[PDB]
Design a protein around this ligand. Structure first.
Ligand SMILES: O=[N+]([O-])c1ccc(O)c(O)c1
Ligand SMILES: O=[N+]([O-])c1ccc(O)c(O)c1
Ligand SMILES: O=[N+]([O-])c1ccc(O)c(O)c1
Ligand SMILES: O=[N+]([O-])c1ccc(O)c(O)c1
Ligand SMILES: [Fe+3]
Ligand SMILES: [Fe+3]
Ligand SMILES: [Fe+3]
Ligand SMILES: [Fe+3]
Lengths: 238, 202, 238, 202, 238, 202, 238, 202
């Protein structure tokens, strides 16, 4: 199999750069259209991260910053599969996550929300997907929080995530939400995505058979990256 | 067939997750950063720096930037590189950085990449691939950094020539400066407005 | 106006005593039918509690047990109206509430769930409704938690409540849930209630216009008690 | 017209909320309890105690019990009392208690209530109205406590006579005992099974 | 009752500033997003106008400018209630109205439409709502008129109105239309409002039982302003 | 709950209704205007004037402007003011004006307001609240006018500090001038474009 | 992969113990609720049976008891797959089956139905599933038969089956029916199962493409057992 | 995800299929039975026997019973056993039996199992896992058999301690008897009623 380029990104499946209901985008969006280029080796390659460098608790946000006790909040496991658009698993991709604590407070200097800080929660983790594209991490469910867009704007609970995988063209940062959160219907950031089916693609689903008795609940969330096409005739990449 | 997961902004705290060490969160033993030069890395050392500006000229102090580039001989440290050439074994080719919270300056320590094949037998001028994430940016913005001292190579670069506005081509060229022996390339990015930097859909 | 008896309780609008899917009810439910009696002064009277005895923070679960800091969790206000079945407000009724903390852990000796305890959260409050039947309290949203019915049983987040109002026949203890919680559909305790409309009567609704910017969210929850009939002919009560 | 809010069990922690003081939670200055006798309260002091048993005879150690009763002259301390008689001003008429976590015994200190009018000119025998809440109990169970030394009054009580099984009437009669000067009435409640206590829909 | 801030204005319930089909808005709309602020005493207060200063015919557009005779046109009464978003009446609010005459001609220097001027019609009135939020005025139904947006643009018949009420944040100017006017479906100014339900909120309804025999027809039109939230915990306004 | 009635433009004739006297329509005995100073009004008299410009720099000659402000001691003549201080009894605190049809200049005669409490114990710098209506404006635009001679107070103003672009903060500061004994504050408003005035959602 | 416990059995997907329409259950059902326990090595292990001990005709009910001739009745093959609830095949599980003959008569001492006995039919077989979870056996289609519940009760044709697989918690005995049998709608034993979808889970489907010309028909029937969860954090099993 | 196949009763002929040999059907060469002791099996030989009774006290003569247990050292002959200890190679750990059609007695010849680890480092008392199938039983009933001569171990057993009714714990303890040199444990099972045996959802 000789690989060709990644399938073109479908711009209608993503938010546009300029989205007036998300006020900060008004001055941080290019006025010119993006220039589409044909891919080269620069766009189809990406770095490799070795598992050797990851610590044992890097995917365990409940314990990786615990000092005197356990963080306060709802214990949850999140797991799922990363695949490309043609359904192939994405192996050894680096998944990084960050989030607020149970109060909706981030452990960042600029976050001065009154929601209380948790001395035993850090809020960041990372993992590499396995050969089946599977990933699993444990955390405390984040709380929603207020932010200044309109004065009473509130984000639904969410976990931020980032993926570095096989090709630079696949580079993606997004956010997933929790099934049933009522703030999902009102969020101007989630509403930058044009279609309802794509908004639903960011909701992690309750996975009841995988709850761990007297311990933790579980959410299932799958991620799809751009996929490469195979070449059978002229290989113009190089 | 499946649809790609939709992008969402990284938000204003994108460094808790991507550069914890710099948000004062010591959760990892090994931390990713903006230094791509290891002691045995081959090539000429260069420093890449600049600021990112919004539509009113204010620098973004919450921005997260990553770069991806080839080694000194134009080979990518990636299994997808099909040149059949050996890559420098002491080079990751990637790094990440945020802007300084006060000044807004960002930087990387890396090496000047060698030229990489383009499509259909062409040769691309040396370049670094760069992506920007921040509150207000719904999808990471892709751009490239070329070098003003590679004018000969730049004039024959396929991607640069594909931009019909020559006034916009210049937004992709960093300026070489020499601060006390060190070679520095200054590359400022204007997200919107006059002299708006060219961004690509790759 | 001369008052007669409270309207008969509609047993089809409540759970039955014996509900096999809630295992503890199997040995704690009478085998004989309840004996219905005609009401007397004993059933139509109830005690009076004076507002003078309530402390200033009795309805503020965020601060009434705070010692070194604020409790960790989602700040929420819950408010609503208590009325009788004929729509009249229920004035000066005593509303008592208790709940788990953000981890789903109760501050009770017998609760040994691994969800972490919060040293700044107590979990109990009380208030008297006003002349319009209105009540309002502030708290931290409780987390769901595991319990042993079937081994992997999980309660949806809920707040327990109790009402003592004008007549002993109105005495009621129940629980309300939060709009959108997916565990609501699986709870065997909530499923003891026969009809869907009555199950919905226990869900507190997100009240977005009443959120307090950069501070707290708000849920609206109304409660209906039995109502008294007026007498226009023979007054047999006595 | 509206439907009554549906009942749900109080659950196993019903005392965090209803008797915090006894779960070691000091959040309130004034706490409600099982002592209905104030220093100037009129009437003869009595102690009411017992245990609550499940269908296998095991006592419930998580039960919450409240009682509601008239003062010494049969007047309720409630605005809904229409007797036109003055009530004892130092009597709440209500109390609450839980079972001891080890033994399962519950108790109240109160006074023996006087007789209260029944319907259509009848007179009810002295009684205390009692309600039970606990994990497993979906709706609070209502019952009444009558006194074995009021046999004459009990035989003419309308509610007791409305129970057609005389063997079940006896489950509602507490037994008087005299522990060192104090008058005690023992009232055990069997929720299910043999000698199941009578419960009412009121 | 201690009052807190007005509920946030729901921007999705109003037209946006930039609306290209209404050409004059293209150069009169800010390019930057509005900056949301938390309210202070400046935003929650407003002036008081005394009824003593209003003349007897201020709400009677049929007679307040009549000199030699009555104005020509359809005699109509318009009445209704002003309330806040939580349903409370808005008392002593100043309602000002202005409109074209029966020909669709305004008594303004710049209006040179051929529709004829009426020497006995002025076109402006004002009133204060009563304690129930009620207002009533009498006028001549205005005619539609042409304006230059696209060359053959025509406004449906409408009456312009303005409200100054209890808080500066409630300040509102809008326009109401008459049930059944077919020009309502084509107006680019009314179409700046995004949702159909909100477009309907500007249509005054025929109120047949309130017509006055051999005299005038009647339209019913209610207005809703932003409402204030009550504060039960910290009062941060000051 | 109800939705707020949707806003619509005031249209080009907004003064028939709001300033009839100036459209030559004498229908009212008492007319509202742009003079907030009565003979016994306390405080220093000031004149506020300027022009409103569209995106091409043309002044709007059909604009309607109202202002709302506190008296000389920072008290609002409104029942909603909770300072517990007595307000100047000869001050309405509000006025209305239109631009001159030829020149486009607008003005008010009022007094310099005193400072008003901000939230959580803060103090706001003296300011006048201003709103603009006109053909093309779908919803009234809210802004505030601060005074350049109150630089000390302005630097500590909560609302001004909440604007992250310091270049935009300056659009809200009027310039003091002294025309023949009178104090005048010039405040021009640019609705769109370069130096666009800051507008608020209040 | 480290395995944790089997997913909890979903009691709503199975019949209850007490089912009054199946009269024999009235005195053979516990009155107390089942006590749920957390699993240990006892519940997750099970025995292993070796294929070496099975005879060549153990899965061929047409020939394994044939003496003088072939049994009388409809020749049918039944095949399918055994998987766990998460879709994984169940390998080397022991499947045992027993059934009546074509007359609806069992070769049991206590069966004295007048339906005739077949001297060449035994009625019992067994097999081990293969590595794909596949099993196949051949038999004579059983006839329906009368039994005493109500006096005229009739069982639809069915084949009884039993599975011993990887964990004791998976132990299951049930019965499957044949597509189209009209007695399926009236059987009180099949009606002990609460939901229609689960009743359908016991119907074997005609598999026409797999009929063997001039020989036998074929039914397809798949079986689902409880599945084990994987452990990624604490392994509390031991 | 899939739903487990629903259970159905084994019916009154459950031994045609599960114990053909005993229904006089000789179809298999190797037949499964109730003898778990092979000649080289390690451990002390014991006989387990009893009867199963319905709600009226009548023994079930159509019942099918299977047991599952560890070897003499507490190791299961199963690939799922993770103790890392070698199991007795001459032990299946499972057997099956039916009740005698006349008397209703059932029995197994096996060995006394050794103790098996419980969860979180605990140790379980020796026990045999037992399941019951019969006409009238819609789902196989699971129970466990403990031994009265292991009182010390039983008092620390996690599963037994998880039963809050001590009167019900005793239904799970078989009584040791010594019939002519043989050790016999008698374990009767009452499916319903007084002294109803405890059944588990495992
Ligand atoms: O405005 N903020 O602070 C925000 C907005 C969105 C986010 O996802 C976030 O983490 C912070
Ligand atoms: O079994 N428990 O522990 C429970 C079950 C339900 C409850 O509402 C509760 O507070 C505790
Ligand atoms: O363009 N004009 O003349 C207009 C447009 C809309 C109006 O409501 C109006 O009164 C005048
Ligand atoms: O009552 N019987 O004889 C029965 C009832 C059901 C059966 O599945 C069976 O094989 C026999
Ligand atoms: Fe966020
Ligand atoms: Fe609870
Ligand atoms: Fe108009
Ligand atoms: Fe059968």
């Amino acid at each position: 199999i000789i690989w060709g380029a990644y399938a073109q990104r479908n711009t209608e499946d993503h938010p546009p750069a300029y989205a007036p209901g998300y006020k900060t985008s008004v001055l941080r969006s290019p006025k010119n259209a993006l220039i589409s280029i044909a891919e080269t080796l620069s766009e189809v390659t990406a770095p490799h991260f070795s598992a050797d460098k990851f610590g044992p608790k890097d995917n365990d946000l409940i314990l990786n910053y615990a000092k005197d006790g356990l963080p306060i909040g709802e214990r949850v496991i999140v797991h799922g599969y990363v695949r490309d658009q043609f359904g192939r698993p994405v192996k050894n991709a680096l998944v990084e996550v960050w989030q607020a604590n149970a109060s909706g407070r981030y452990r960042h200097p600029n976050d001065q929300y009154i929601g209380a800080m948790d001395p035993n929660f850090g809020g960041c983790g990372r993992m590499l997907t396995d050969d089946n594209g599977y990933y699993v991490f444990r955390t405390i469910k984040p709380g929603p929080y207020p932010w200044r867009n309109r004065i009473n704007e509130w984000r639904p609970a969410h976990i931020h995530f980032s993926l570095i995988a096989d090709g630079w063209a696949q580079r993606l940062i997004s956010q997933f939400y929790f099934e049933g959160d009522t703030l999902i219907d009102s969020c101007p950031i989630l509403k930058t995505i044009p279609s309802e089916q794509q908004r639903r693609a960011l909701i992690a689903l309750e996975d009841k058979s995988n709850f761990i008795e007297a311990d933790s609940r579980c959410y299932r969330f799958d991620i799809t990256l751009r996929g490469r096409r195979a070449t059978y005739f002229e290989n113009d990449l190089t | 067939e499946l649809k790609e997961t939709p992008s969402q902004t990284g938000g204003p705290y994108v460094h808790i997750g991507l550069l914890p060490k710099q948000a004062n969160i010591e959760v990892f033993e090994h931390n990713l950063d903006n230094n791509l030069v290891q002691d045995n890395t081959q090539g000429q050392r260069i420093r890449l720096e600049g600021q990112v500006f919004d539509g009113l000229g204010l620098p973004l102090r919450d921005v997260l930037i990553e770069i991806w580039q080839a080694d000194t001989n134009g080979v990518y440290p990636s299994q997808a590189d099909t040149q059949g050439k050996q890559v420098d074994p002491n080079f990751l080719g990637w790094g990440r950085t945020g802007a300084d919270f006060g000044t807004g300056f960002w930087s990387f320590n890396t090496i000047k990449p060698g030229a990489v094949p383009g499509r259909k037998g062409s040769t691309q001028a040396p370049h670094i691939s760069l992506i920007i994430f921040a509150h207000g940016i719904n999808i990471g913005l892709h751009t490239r950094v070329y070098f003003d001292d590679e004018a000969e190579a730049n004039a024959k670069d396929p991607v640069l020539n594909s931009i019909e506005w020559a006034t916009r081509r210049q937004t992709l060229v960093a300026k070489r400066e020499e601060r006390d022996g060190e070679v520095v390339y200054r590359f400022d990015i204007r997200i919107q407005g006059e002299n708006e930097t060219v961004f690509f859909d790759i």
